[PDB]
């Protein structure tokens, strides 16, 4: 008679797991909502300048800020190995100190000024 009892005990798993599928979908919508909120806190308004040195782990790296003190920031999920430059001047966060974007090596400064022309108006030939 144990055959009938062992079956009814298995429907207790089938009872909750039917509505638990949609609970993960509604939770996924909340996770995607929080995912968009975490990206805003990485950059938002405040931004600073820093120089990348060496990484450690995924979303972890050691950089050098403008003040001279090194800080451990959170490497962007897009930058891994090839996309991540070994030594480059990048952007960081004021307080939270998170990686922002790779800044181009601008040669324009107050010393060793080299002029650059944009869209000359002289007609060829």
């Amino acid at each position: 008679y144990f055959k009938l009892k062992k079956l009814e005990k298995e429907y207790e798993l089938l009872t909750l797991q039917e509505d638990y599928i949609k609970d993960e979908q509604r939770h996924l919508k909340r996770e995607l909502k929080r995912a968009q909120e975490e990206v805003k806190r990485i950059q938002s308004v405040p931004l600073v300048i820093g120089q990348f040195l060496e990484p450690i782990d995924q979303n972890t790296g050691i950089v050098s800020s403008t003040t001279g003190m090194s800080y451990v920031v959170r490497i962007l999920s897009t930058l891994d190995r090839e996309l991540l430059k070994p030594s480059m001047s990048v952007a960081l966060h004021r307080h939270s100190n998170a990686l922002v974007d790779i800044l181009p090596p601008d040669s324009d400064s107050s010393i060793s000024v080299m002029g650059e022309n944009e869209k000359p108006d002289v007609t060829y030939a």
């Binding site: 975490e38 806190r41 990485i42 979303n59 972890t60 050691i62 003190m69 090194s70 800080y71 451990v72 920031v73 959170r74 939270s96 100190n97 998170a98």
Partner: peptide, 12 residues
């Protein structure tokens, strides 16, 4: 996210 973004930073 809350663990890494709230890290004040560390030097060498």
């Amino acid at each position: 996210e809350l663990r890494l973004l709230q890290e004040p930073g560390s030097y060498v």
